[PDB]
Amino acid sequence: VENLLTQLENELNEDNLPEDINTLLRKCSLNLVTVVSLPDMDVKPLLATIKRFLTSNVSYDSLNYDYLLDVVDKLVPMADFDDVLEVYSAEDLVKALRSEIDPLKVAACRVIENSQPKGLFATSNIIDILLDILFDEKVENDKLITAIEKALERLSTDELIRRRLFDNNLPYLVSVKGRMETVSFVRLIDFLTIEFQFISGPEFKDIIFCFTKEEILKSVEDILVFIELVNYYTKFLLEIRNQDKYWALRHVKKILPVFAQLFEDTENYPDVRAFSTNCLLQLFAEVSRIEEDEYSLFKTMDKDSLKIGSEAKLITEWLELINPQYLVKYHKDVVENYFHVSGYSIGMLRNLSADEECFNAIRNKFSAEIVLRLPYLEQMQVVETLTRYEYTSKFLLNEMPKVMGSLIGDGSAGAIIDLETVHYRNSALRNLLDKGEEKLSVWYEPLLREYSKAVNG
Amino acid sequence: MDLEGRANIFRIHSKSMSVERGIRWELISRLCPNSTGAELRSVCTEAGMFAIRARRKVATEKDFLKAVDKVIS
């Protein structure tokens, strides 16, 4: 039913526009999603036509633009780009963006997204244009904002396209970063987070990425902006630890201590706390996992602002996010005087047992009795976790005999319709089997069968 | 769903509760990307609670942030 609807549409358009052209697009679109590659046809009599419908200052009632666009968005990527560029020359785009037609804009936006060399228009102004429409506080049409954003994220892979961003627009970016206007500002922040992934050490101007200690304090006046930034940084530190970009740490290491203070100082800056408390803890949990020497930076933020331990209201919170290693060393007394095996602490247990050393501090709170007390649903969650590490498994497989069984036979483990319990239980077996028959002493037989019975049904 | 459907979900699930005009959904949503379609809903219901928790009978944009931070953490 591919080439069938292919021409069924192209022709219904050259007519007087039947009152079902909206339905024809609706379904013919899903057929495209299935079949990956396209036949050996020419996409000129179609795209060169739809372009006429979108560029036409005249609209039609019997035509749901939303669908018509969904078709184009799923056609440009399939067919070769050389043929696409023939319908949309490098100059056509420039006009499509400067036109007063939103539906037309979103079109070229995705045509640029699938530009053959990710550094083709790298020497054009089309890139600066999109950036101009993106940070244009006026533009409310979402379908466009995203279309452009997703278009940049795909081209920002090339080295050239990035230059046209942080070299041919460096002044404009710093500009928007200066106006700091809710709408416009926020759009730049989410953008930066995306670019920091395809950026190297040299091509990195801390004049658009890093924020002055002042800027942060000046955003607190518009919480929406403050929160959006705390998350930006939280992700920034995240991206660093995973992609081993320990070079950036030197930059975003001066402002981190600023957040810690804003968090503590509730008298002045009351908003910050009870208006972004959680999103902040998310950052402190990332700072504790920063690649530094003897946890220098964090060791101070804790001793100065985030006085972990002092506030009980947060004790649980802390032991659920803050690095387990740092906790078992500079706050061992805490992880030792509060973590109690329960469906409630099911959270802490996951983060705390992340470090063999840390675990060996809570392992004294564990006991088959306390575990089998709580309902099955929570048991699987606790068990499954104790099987996410080797040092924890050994424990569950020995010191905890009874529990191990409460995981396999019961008479009809299939009587478990609870999707959640099934998830954890079935998982607690998957990683528990990777232990190998050697280690899994006498539980191998029951496991390989209980898991097999679950994998099938 | 990331083509800013999160924005729509809000707009739609909102016109069934007491909420003042304005409330830039485009931004409120940019604070919940990985939020599976269902998550958006859990925020709205909570948002209204803060408005009640206080006094107002209508939810303001700030009540949503007070919820998103309490939901998506």
Side-chain angles (χ1 to χ4, degrees), chain A residues 97-119:
Chain A
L97 299 166
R98 294 188 184 299
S99 80
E100 219 68 71
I101 309 163
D102 278 316
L104 171 57
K105 292 174 156 194
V106 67
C109 288
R110 310 188 166 171
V111 183
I112 302 168
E113 170 180 55
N114 299 292
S115 78
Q116 178 36 60
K118 291 193 173 178

Side-chain angles (χ1 to χ4, degrees), chain A residues 21-74:
Chain A
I21 193 63
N22 67 301
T23 314
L24 173 54
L25 296 165
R26 156 95 288 195
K27 293 190 275 294
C28 75
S29 286
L30 192 280
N31 293 63
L32 303 152
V33 188
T34 58
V35 188
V36 177
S37 188
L38 281 169
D40 218 8
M41 48 187 228
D42 195 12
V43 294
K44 304 304 177 307
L46 190 282
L47 302 183
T49 304
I50 292 188
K51 174 194 186 307
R52 194 194 314 120
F53 262 95
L54 292 179
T55 58
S56 71
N57 204 187
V58 181
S59 299
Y60 301 103
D61 305 68
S62 64
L63 173 57
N64 188 169
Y65 274 107
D66 284 294
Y67 293 124
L68 165 58
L69 288 170
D70 184 70
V71 173
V72 196
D73 166 60
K74 299 170 181 177

Side-chain angles (χ1 to χ4, degrees), chain A residues 174-432:
Chain A
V174 182
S175 148
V176 198
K177 180 172 108 79
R179 82 156 48 141
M180 202 205 251
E181 181 288 298
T182 319
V183 178
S184 59
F185 188 66
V186 168
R187 300 208 189 162
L188 178 57
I189 309 306
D190 282 325
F191 160 100
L192 297 176
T193 318
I194 302 158
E195 289 302 299
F196 183 47
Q197 307 189 304
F198 331 135
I199 284 188
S200 73
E203 43 164 50
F204 174 71
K205 285 68 174 190
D206 55 308
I207 178 53
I208 177 57
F209 280 117
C210 284
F211 286 175
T212 71
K213 357 282 184 173
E214 185 200 76
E215 292 175 85
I216 276 60
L217 293 139
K218 190 156 62 184
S219 77
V220 169
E221 299 173 51
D222 180 31
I223 281 298
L224 191 287
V225 167
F226 178 72
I227 296 188
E228 167 59 41
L229 287 195
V230 180
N231 283 322
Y232 160 81
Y233 266 128
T234 296
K235 296 190 211 171
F236 192 95
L237 280 185
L238 196 299
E239 187 68 28
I240 292 176
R241 193 195 50 197
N242 297 0
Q243 269 64 305
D244 303 319
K245 301 187 172 190
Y246 313 135
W247 85 69
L249 291 183
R250 169 169 54 75
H251 302 80
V252 298
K253 232 166 89 176
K254 306 188 177 71
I255 46 282
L256 290 199
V258 178
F259 295 112
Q261 288 134 40
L262 282 154
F263 177 91
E264 111 72 8
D265 196 30
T266 53
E267 204 57 56
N268 319 288
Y269 297 117
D271 289 30
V272 173
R273 181 57 100 84
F275 211 139
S276 83
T277 283
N278 277 328
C279 90
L280 267 189
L281 288 155
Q282 227 62 292
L283 180 58
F284 305 143
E286 200 63 29
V287 171
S288 50
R289 232 85 59 167
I290 198 169
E291 275 273 59
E292 64 183 319
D293 176 63
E294 193 68 8
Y295 308 126
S296 195
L297 168 52
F298 195 87
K299 192 194 293 181
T300 31
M301 294 173 54
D302 180 308
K303 207 282 224 299
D304 295 311
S305 312
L306 333 166
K307 306 198 165 183
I308 284 182
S310 65
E311 286 169 353
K313 320 75 202 122
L314 275 126
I315 293 186
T316 166
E317 271 76 42
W318 288 138
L319 299 102
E320 298 191 314
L321 312 114
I322 272 47
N323 184 300
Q325 316 193 185
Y326 174 83
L327 273 181
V328 62
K329 305 176 183 67
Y330 301 93
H331 285 301
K332 187 191 174 190
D333 64 316
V334 166
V335 183
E336 226 165 46
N337 285 299
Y338 219 107
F339 169 69
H340 299 163
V341 194
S342 166
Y344 142 73
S345 80
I346 207 289
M348 321 193 238
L349 187 270
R350 275 153 170 173
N351 167 56
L352 241 38
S353 78
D355 170 25
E356 168 161 34
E357 191 179 328
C358 197
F359 177 79
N360 279 305
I362 61 173
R363 72 100 64 193
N364 98 276
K365 294 298 185 301
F366 265 91
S367 78
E369 294 73 11
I370 303 175
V371 170
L372 292 182
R373 216 313 82 180
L374 48 96
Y376 207 56
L377 176 47
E378 290 116 79
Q379 263 172 43
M380 287 322 93
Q381 295 184 310
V382 174
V383 165
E384 183 274 336
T385 305
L386 297 179
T387 74
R388 268 141 84 176
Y389 304 102
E390 89 89 10
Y391 52 87
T392 40
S393 301
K394 181 185 173 179
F395 176 64
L396 180 77
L397 260 325
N398 309 338
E399 318 289 276
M400 215 108 87
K402 227 171 299 184
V403 163
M404 270 298 300
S406 175
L407 161 73
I408 343 178
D410 188 3
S412 65
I416 305 168
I417 308 82
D418 196 315
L419 173 56
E420 284 284 326
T421 313
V422 164
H423 169 227
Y424 292 116
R425 178 180 180 293
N426 285 54
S427 170
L429 306 173
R430 184 173 311 93
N431 34 53
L432 198 54

Side-chain angles (χ1 to χ4, degrees), chain A residues 142 150 187 277-279, chain B residues 3 11 24 26 30 69:
Chain A
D142 309 320
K150 289 171 184 179
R187 300 208 189 162
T277 283
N278 277 328
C279 90
Chain B
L3 269 88
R11 277 187 286 279
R24 285 143 321 178
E26 168 172 356
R30 281 173 183 278
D69 194 73

